Amino acid sequence: KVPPHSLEAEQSVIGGLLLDNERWDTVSEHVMTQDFYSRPHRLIFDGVKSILEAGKPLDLITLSEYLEQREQLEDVGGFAYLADLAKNTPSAANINAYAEIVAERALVRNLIGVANEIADAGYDPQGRNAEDLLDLAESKVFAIAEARTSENEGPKNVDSILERTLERIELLYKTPQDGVTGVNTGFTDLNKKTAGLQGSDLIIVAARPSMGKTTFAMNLCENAAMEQDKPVLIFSLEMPAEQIMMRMLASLSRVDQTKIRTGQLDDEDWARISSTMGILMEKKNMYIDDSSGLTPTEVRSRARRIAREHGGLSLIMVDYLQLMRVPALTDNRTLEIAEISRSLKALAKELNVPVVALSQLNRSLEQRADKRPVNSDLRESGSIEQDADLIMFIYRDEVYHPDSPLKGTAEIIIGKQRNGPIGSVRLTFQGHYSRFDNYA
Amino acid sequence: IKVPPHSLEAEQSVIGGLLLDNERWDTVSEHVMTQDFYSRPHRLIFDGVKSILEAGKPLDLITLSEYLEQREQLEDVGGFAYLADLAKNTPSAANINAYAEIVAERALVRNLIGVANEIADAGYDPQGRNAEDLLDLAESKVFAIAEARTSENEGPKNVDSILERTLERIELLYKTPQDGVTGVNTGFTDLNKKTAGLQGSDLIIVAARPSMGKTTFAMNLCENAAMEQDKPVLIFSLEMPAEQIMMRMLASLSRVDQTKIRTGQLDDEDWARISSTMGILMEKKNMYIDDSSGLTPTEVRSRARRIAREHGGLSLIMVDYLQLMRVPALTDNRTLEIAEISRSLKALAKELNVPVVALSQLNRSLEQRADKRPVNSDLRESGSIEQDADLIMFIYRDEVYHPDSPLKGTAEIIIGKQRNGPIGSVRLTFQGHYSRFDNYAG
Amino acid sequence: KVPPHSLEAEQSVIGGLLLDNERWDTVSEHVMTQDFYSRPHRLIFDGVKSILEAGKPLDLITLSEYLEQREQLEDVGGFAYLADLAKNTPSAANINAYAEIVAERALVRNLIGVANEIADAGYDPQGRNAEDLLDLAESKVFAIAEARTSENEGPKNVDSILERTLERIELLYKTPQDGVTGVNTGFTDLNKKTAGLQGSDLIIVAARPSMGKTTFAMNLCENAAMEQDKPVLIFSLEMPAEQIMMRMLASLSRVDQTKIRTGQLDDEDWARISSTMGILMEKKNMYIDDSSGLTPTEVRSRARRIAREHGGLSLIMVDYLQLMRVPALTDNRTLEIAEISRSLKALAKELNVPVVALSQLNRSLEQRADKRPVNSDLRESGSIEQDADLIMFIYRDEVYHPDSPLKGTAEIIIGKQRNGPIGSVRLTFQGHYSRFDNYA
Amino acid sequence: KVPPHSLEAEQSVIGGLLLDNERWDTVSEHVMTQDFYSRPHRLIFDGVKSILEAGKPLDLITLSEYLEQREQLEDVGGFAYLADLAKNTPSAANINAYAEIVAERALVRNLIGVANEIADAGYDPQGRNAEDLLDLAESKVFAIAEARTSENEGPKNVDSILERTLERIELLYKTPQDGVTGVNTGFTDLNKKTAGLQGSDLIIVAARPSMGKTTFAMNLCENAAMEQDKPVLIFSLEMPAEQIMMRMLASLSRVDQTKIRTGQLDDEDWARISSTMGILMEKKNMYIDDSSGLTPTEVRSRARRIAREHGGLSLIMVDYLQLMRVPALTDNRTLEIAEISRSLKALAKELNVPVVALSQLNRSLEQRADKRPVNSDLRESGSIEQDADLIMFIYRDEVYHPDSPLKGTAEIIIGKQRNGPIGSVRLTFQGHYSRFDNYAG
Numbered sequence A, C: 001k002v003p004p005h006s007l008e009a010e011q012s013v014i015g016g017l018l019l020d021n022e023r024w025d026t027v028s029e030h031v032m033t034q035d036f037y038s039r040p041h042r043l044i045f046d047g048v049k050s051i052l053e054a055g056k057p058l059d060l061i062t063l064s065e066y067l068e069q070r071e072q073l074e075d076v077g078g079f080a081y082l083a084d085l086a087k088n089t090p091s092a093a094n095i096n097a098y099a100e101i102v103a104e105r106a107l108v109r110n111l112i113g114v115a116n117e118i119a120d121a122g123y124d125p126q127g128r129n130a131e132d133l134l135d136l137a138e139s140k141v142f143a144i145a146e147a148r149t150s151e152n153e154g155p156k157n158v159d160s161i162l163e164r165t166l167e168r169i170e171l172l173y174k175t176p177q178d179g180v181t182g183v184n185t186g187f188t189d190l191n192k193k194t195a196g197l198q199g200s201d202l203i204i205v206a207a208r209p210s211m212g213k214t215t216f217a218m219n220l221c222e223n224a225a226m227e228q229d230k231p232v233l234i235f236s237l238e239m240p241a242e243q244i245m246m247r248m249l250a251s252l253s254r255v256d257q258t259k260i261r262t263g264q265l266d267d268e269d270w271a272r273i274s275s276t277m278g279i280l281m282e283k284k285n286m287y288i289d290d291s292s293g294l295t296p297t298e299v300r301s302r303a304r305r306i307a308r309e310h311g312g313l314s315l316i317m318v319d320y321l322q323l324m325r326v327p328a329l330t331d332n333r334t335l336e337i338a339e340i341s342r343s344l345k346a347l348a349k350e351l352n353v354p355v356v357a358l359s360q361l362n363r364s365l366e367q368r369a370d371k372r373p374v375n376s377d378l379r380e381s382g383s384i385e386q387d388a389d390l391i392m393f394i395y396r397d398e399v400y401h402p403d404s405p406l407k408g409t410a411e412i413i414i415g416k417q418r419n420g421p422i423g424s425v426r427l428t429f430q431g432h433y434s435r436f437d438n439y440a
Numbered sequence B: 001i002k003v004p005p006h007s008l009e010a011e012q013s014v015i016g017g018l019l020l021d022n023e024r025w026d027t028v029s030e031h032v033m034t035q036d037f038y039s040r041p042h043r044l045i046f047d048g049v050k051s052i053l054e055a056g057k058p059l060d061l062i063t064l065s066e067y068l069e070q071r072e073q074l075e076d077v078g079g080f081a082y083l084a085d086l087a088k089n090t091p092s093a094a095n096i097n098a099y100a101e102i103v104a105e106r107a108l109v110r111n112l113i114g115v116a117n118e119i120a121d122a123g124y125d126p127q128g129r130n131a132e133d134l135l136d137l138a139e140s141k142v143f144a145i146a147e148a149r150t151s152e153n154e155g156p157k158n159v160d161s162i163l164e165r166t167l168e169r170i171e172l173l174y175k176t177p178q179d180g181v182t183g184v185n186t187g188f189t190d191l192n193k194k195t196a197g198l199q200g201s202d203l204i205i206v207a208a209r210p211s212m213g214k215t216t217f218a219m220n221l222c223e224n225a226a227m228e229q230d231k232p233v234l235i236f237s238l239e240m241p242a243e244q245i246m247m248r249m250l251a252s253l254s255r256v257d258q259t260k261i262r263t264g265q266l267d268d269e270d271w272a273r274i275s276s277t278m279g280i281l282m283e284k285k286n287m288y289i290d291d292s293s294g295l296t297p298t299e300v301r302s303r304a305r306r307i308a309r310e311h312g313g314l315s316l317i318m319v320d321y322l323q324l325m326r327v328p329a330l331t332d333n334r335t336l337e338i339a340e341i342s343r344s345l346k347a348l349a350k351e352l353n354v355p356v357v358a359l360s361q362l363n364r365s366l367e368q369r370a371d372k373r374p375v376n377s378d379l380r381e382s383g384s385i386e387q388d389a390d391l392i393m394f395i396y397r398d399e400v401y402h403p404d405s406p407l408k409g410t411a412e413i414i415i416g417k418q419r420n421g422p423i424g425s426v427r428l429t430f431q432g433h434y435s436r437f438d439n440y441a442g
Numbered sequence D: 001k002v003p004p005h006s007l008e009a010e011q012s013v014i015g016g017l018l019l020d021n022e023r024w025d026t027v028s029e030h031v032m033t034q035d036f037y038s039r040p041h042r043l044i045f046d047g048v049k050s051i052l053e054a055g056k057p058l059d060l061i062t063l064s065e066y067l068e069q070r071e072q073l074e075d076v077g078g079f080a081y082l083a084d085l086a087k088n089t090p091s092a093a094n095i096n097a098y099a100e101i102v103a104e105r106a107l108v109r110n111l112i113g114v115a116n117e118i119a120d121a122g123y124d125p126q127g128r129n130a131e132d133l134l135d136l137a138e139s140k141v142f143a144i145a146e147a148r149t150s151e152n153e154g155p156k157n158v159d160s161i162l163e164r165t166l167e168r169i170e171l172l173y174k175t176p177q178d179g180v181t182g183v184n185t186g187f188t189d190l191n192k193k194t195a196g197l198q199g200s201d202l203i204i205v206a207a208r209p210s211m212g213k214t215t216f217a218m219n220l221c222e223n224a225a226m227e228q229d230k231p232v233l234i235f236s237l238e239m240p241a242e243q244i245m246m247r248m249l250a251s252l253s254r255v256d257q258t259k260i261r262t263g264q265l266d267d268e269d270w271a272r273i274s275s276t277m278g279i280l281m282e283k284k285n286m287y288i289d290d291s292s293g294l295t296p297t298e299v300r301s302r303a304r305r306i307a308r309e310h311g312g313l314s315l316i317m318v319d320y321l322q323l324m325r326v327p328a329l330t331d332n333r334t335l336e337i338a339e340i341s342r343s344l345k346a347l348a349k350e351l352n353v354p355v356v357a358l359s360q361l362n363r364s365l366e367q368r369a370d371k372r373p374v375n376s377d378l379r380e381s382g383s384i385e386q387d388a389d390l391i392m393f394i395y396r397d398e399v400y401h402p403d404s405p406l407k408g409t410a411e412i413i414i415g416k417q418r419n420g421p422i423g424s425v426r427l428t429f430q431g432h433y434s435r436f437d438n439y440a441g
């Protein structure tokens, strides 16, 4: 069987670039040295990539001298190969189209290389289980799909920006806003600044330990399961599915958590518990995943399952970003968090649903004396701010100071917002029932 | 030529062990089906098993033989000799659920190779299919195996399964007379009101400044834990030996000063209280002390599993010092050493479903702070503890910092963190002589 | 010659563990993967160690699948080897006895491997001298004796603890204590907390440079040579035997060191010097080793010599723990200090005599502003606190502050004590005569 | 396999002892009859041990008659073996070194004999268990370590120490001390606390840059070359030999450095310069090494050279401890300084002369506001305090404060002293002539 490649297409990219150097700006955007099939073609392009990047003029002799010094000239096929290359394809402007068909053959070749990697790992497991082999197969397949999206990105001209900016103002003015657009948060004061939990964008809710990360995230999921028709998916890594349910019953029935974990509660308290269960089983939107160490592959497979089974998802939530692990970057922690954050943003776009990830801030804010959470304390964990579209921090002054002003009232300080503006929203926190309500 | 992923012994173990015990079919049918079996004779035999056991009819060597004989599949599977040797092989029970998992394991990999070969053959032979078209065809076929995979224990749960499990917990709690205590009794009535007992499977950290009474308060919990709870208590003494712990134990229960014990001088009246202590101690024999200097997170797990398997199961695990514990891999990085030790202790608590009481020390930052009231920030300097912990309680005695401080001889256990319940402060009278923590009245 | 091994004993351990999984708790305590002779037996046990550790059931097929995936099944001897293993030895409970005889053959095999290592190094030295070859032979022999003691340690039931605790209290109440138990320190205020320098336990005296580490250690040895009948051994690494003697004469005669090193002293001063020599030569308990760089093997050999020659030792003292060196762990300093501290504790138990080691604290305490020595400043040097049974620090406030309160009075702050309690003892320091006396 | 032995080494011990009988006193201390490999060599030495012990003269015929009577002469190899033995190795004094290598081969031979004993007992246990075989192996190994009595490093009883200590005090009481003991510093106020620059101990003079580290060190060397008869060695790393000489001429002639570097000075100033040169060339004790980056090996080799050439040294001085480098620990700076400090202390003991090393303190004292040098500021550079026997810091208040009290007077604060006490000595500093003189008032 012959591998998918086109020798004429590889010759057309280099052959037409020797005559016109100006086309390199758009040609380099589509292909690289790795995309070329044969070894002499890879060696020739490796010189092209170096000469044209510096801004130096590229021709038949300038490229020949780069190969002659490295003694690759007699290896590629002498000067006769370079001479026949300039002679062939004297066409211009269509070089961008020639670069697309080189990337086309290379992508299929990379896909077969991954398909054979899965097959060889299947017959020869060497300790690898069915669960381990499933993650290895999907992670390698996603690498081709991830590389296919990193291309064509870069800076933007005013034409594309103005059209996108004016359309945003027009649609906002047209619709009767009332804050809500997309997914309802449940808080009127928050909806004014947030403009609802937008689809396909990554949301990170970060706070100091025992501030109420899981509490506030669940408080969003209470209203997300009630308001939105489509189901809500929750990945509980830290605490089990049972503990989440006790906090859920307390938030909706509005009866203290201490009464639930002990079991002692009167007939009056039981009536509020009874009313909660009824509304919960009418929609059945809530789904909890009580898994200790999830992989970015396992999150994708389980999200696709519920979306295919129940029409489609509405909101995905993660109990802990740090508790998630990647098998490839286990050694490097900085790259582990960077890839997990990159995988969660790509999962949001894949399903067009808001992803609410919970992350913890470094001890730097406690030493800082100000103790008001800043984005810099979260950068110490890994690359989160770059991938995130909306970052909101939970800060309760009653934690640091005993008789602090507005005791029992927390302020959700919005540290980052790509879509809208940044600020701070005060919400009354009821510790007993683990509820976040609108402050008046 | 490559051999497909299958195990003939694993396929034989599922059927072979199910012929003797019919009751196991309830959990075995949950993992595998007729399609999961590799060879044709194995598929024909299981197809009969699936039909006989579903009706509730007894399954044996002849009942299964008659199902095959009527369909003329008996001479095709390998006669009665194949069925006879199947019942003879693997006379083991209960591990049939584990045998069903490895049959599904080989079948899933076999399905994955079938998809991997489908992608490879479509790659070389596109027939109109473009790179974009081939990418969608490859991912959709791979996702079909991940969608069909319905692993129970780890994976998604619908509200129906969760609500039923949650409501059964509240029902059993409302039925039984709670009296505040839920799980493990601390021994202090004022503490039990806020703590709601030492909950199972959650991580508890008792942190204080040196010589405040970390080992003293932890042992004071273990005095009542060995008396109240029927299941044994495990203690890992890293700092001080097993002998020193016992002298503090005898002083706490007999209520005779430690200074009398270490010198040996005590009257007949003092000896009578010592005598009464030993009697109750040897009636239950719940106390277990590990006098090891530098324990590893692997050594803690192995020793905890031993006592749990030998004495039915544990009730409470205690560590004398979190900082004295060491990890061989992260010896160079101290921040990662403490982070992994704290992560290992929480995972050990969940593994045995028992409260783990770890003792940690706070940084000198609180002494410079002038307030000297312990805060969680002083413990974060040691490593990642607050993130893993479920309950953090600090020991603060005002008589240490100030000589004639108000409520002298009374310490306040300030609860810095509680994931399950609320946070506060509980005052308990501290008797330094006998190394006892008792309930304060007033 | 056939190596010491038993194939039936190796087969009996695995063969009886396949049927009864519950026995692994006590079997794993005696043997490991390294103890098995043949390669197929090592591969089979390596699977047993992994499956039973997780808690997963161990049988004929579960173990076969672990080998089949790693392609070790056809290498160990097919399924027929595993089948005949389960058939053989159907006995239970005696598996713990089978594990002991596997460790027995393996220990002798390791001893021969060390015996051949010494013999081959003898004929082929390659730069190694007689002194170098002696240290290499003893260090390798001690490694087998050290591994023989690390086993069978683990958790303890109340039965073993109570019997050991009650025997300690009974013997203490029986004997007329008078504070002192074991070796007399010479200080009445110190003896109350220390309860004498206990036998077989490791003692570390740590302080900041020029605080009086050598001064206080010698002040203990003054009284140790006078009170105790058995001789005292001192390893002087930093200063020579002559300098130690001048400090010794000054401490007992009570005449300033400055008079001795200059030689100018009157008839009244000479009479006190004369009285010192008389008592010194009556017992002759003092022994000084003026060696620059001692090895843990050299310390053991020289300690055994004096103990065998003079009935037995009473107290061993080291001038500097950091000045001692190990030839194997020369590159890694953290492991060098860790092994030296581990060797000194094992030497104390071997001779049942208190070992007084002198160590220096890191500069961290000077930057700390408090300047009161803590155990954390000593951990920076290496693993000392874990091995040590008693740690006492020397802190003189007159060093840091000129007109400090209680000038000429040092406080011996006990940082660690495994046997008894921790505190602080004030002793009057006389810099002139290099004496530590009881403060009143 | 050939057993560890040296026939030439066995021949060298006896061969060189036949000519010089006086060496037996130190040769018998290292080896015995058992240490000799071959049987004829053992028989010959057995006679040597008996004849020389009585005090009888040992030669070719006296030893031959001892063997001839016992009929061992024809067994050892006739008189021809004894004749060729006296002919071979006509060297003397190195016989003690030949005895050490005979004991070296014998100890390894005994170790192999024990190693083979363990191996043979391992394969053939005959009732012996693993616990029994472990005790048998260790007890036999310890027997070689117990028999090993290495002199130079081994244990010393109080009898040998007291006799050596009392002889030191006796010689010191006999000679007129006058406070100064060892090397004269030149300062009367300093000599009272320091008790002279003691031999074989390491001295570190540390101060903040431009305080006068090189100035004070040279001020010690001015008096060290004048008072002490034995030469003084100086390793100038920072500045060259010429710059050191201009500071030297200024200190003794007592004429400002600014006049010397410009060259302008009157006949009155030249007369003081003239008097300096005269006294300098009368003793010629000063030696300067203008090398940029010296290694601890290069310092040892150059110190041994001057000591062997000029009878022996008196004081070794280093311009900069930090400027010195080690080729092995080039990457790790903390270990570089630690080994350099350890090498300089071992060099001091090797030559029994005070080593004056100059080191710089960290910027921590400037931030501290007190600015009075403490030992903690020097620990940041490396491991110096642990190796050092005497540390003295230079602190001038006129540097930090313009009109500071006692302007032109520096205080040498003694931070460490293992031998004597710690304090502070005030000395008047004359910046012009780069002189440190005794302060009065």
Ligand SMILES: Nc1nc2c(ncn2[C@@H]2O[C@H](COP(=O)(O)OP(=O)(O)O)[C@@H](O)[C@H]2O)c(=O)[nH]1
Binding pocket: A207, A208, A209, A210, A211, A212, A213, A214, A215, A216, A256, A257, A258, A431, A432, A433, A434, B417, B418, B419, B420, B421, B422, B423
């Ligand atoms: N008053 C009260 N507070 C509670 C109760 N249960 C939990 N809390 C508080 O609710 C918060 C829970 O925060 P959580 O989300 O689990 O922590 P995080 O995810 O680390 O930020 C903590 O501040 C607890 O003190 C309860 O029963 N009563």
Ligand SMILES: Nc1nc2c(ncn2[C@@H]2O[C@H](COP(=O)(O)OP(=O)(O)O)[C@@H](O)[C@H]2O)c(=O)[nH]1
Binding pocket: B208, B209, B210, B211, B212, B213, B214, B215, B216, B217, B257, B258, B259, B432, B433, B434, B435
């Ligand atoms: N009055 C008195 N106090 C004692 C006695 N024994 C111990 N203590 C005190 O009890 C406390 C023991 O604390 P400990 O748990 O060992 O220290 P930690 O683990 O570092 O906090 C200290 O405050 C001691 O002063 C005794 O016999 N009498």
Ligand SMILES: Nc1nc2c(ncn2[C@@H]2O[C@H](COP(=O)(O)OP(=O)(O)O)[C@@H](O)[C@H]2O)c(=O)[nH]1
Binding pocket: C207, C208, C209, C210, C211, C212, C213, C214, C215, C216, C256, C257, C258, C431, C432, C433, C434, D416, D417, D418, D419, D420, D421, D422
């Ligand atoms: N007053 C006085 N102090 C002295 C004399 N000799 C030594 N010292 C002091 O005694 C101490 C000796 O400490 P040393 O044990 O050698 O140092 P370390 O081992 O590094 O702690 C130092 O503080 C010296 O200053 C002396 O003759 N007079």
Ligand SMILES: Nc1nc2c(ncn2[C@@H]2O[C@H](COP(=O)(O)OP(=O)(O)O)[C@@H](O)[C@H]2O)c(=O)[nH]1
Binding pocket: D207, D208, D209, D210, D211, D212, D213, D214, D215, D216, D256, D257, D258, D431, D432, D433, D434
């Ligand atoms: N007044 C005056 N001071 C001088 C003269 N030459 C040098 N000095 C001072 O003498 C000192 C020399 O110190 P030096 O030992 O070289 O520096 P260090 O080794 O870094 O401490 C400095 O404080 C200079 O300012 C001079 O001609 N006149």
Ligand code: ALF
Binding pocket: A208, A209, A210, A213, A214, A238, A360, B386, B387, B388, B419
């Ligand atoms: F302490 Al948490 F999520 F409960 F960081």
Ligand code: ALF
Binding pocket: B209, B210, B211, B214, B215, B239, B361
């Ligand atoms: F001082 Al402690 F446990 F006894 F920290």
Ligand code: ALF
Binding pocket: C208, C209, C210, C213, C214, C238, C360, D385, D386, D387, D388, D418
């Ligand atoms: F300075 Al030292 F022992 F004399 F550390």
Ligand code: ALF
Binding pocket: D208, D209, D210, D213, D214, D238, D360
């Ligand atoms: F500045 Al310098 F020696 F001259 F440190």
Ligand SMILES: [Mg+2]
Binding pocket: A213, A214, A238, A319
């Ligand atoms: Mg959480």
Ligand SMILES: [Mg+2]
Binding pocket: B214, B215, B239, B320
């Ligand atoms: Mg403790």
Ligand SMILES: [Mg+2]
Binding pocket: C213, C214, C238, C319
């Ligand atoms: Mg010392």
Ligand SMILES: [Mg+2]
Binding pocket: D213, D214, D238, D319
């Ligand atoms: Mg200088």
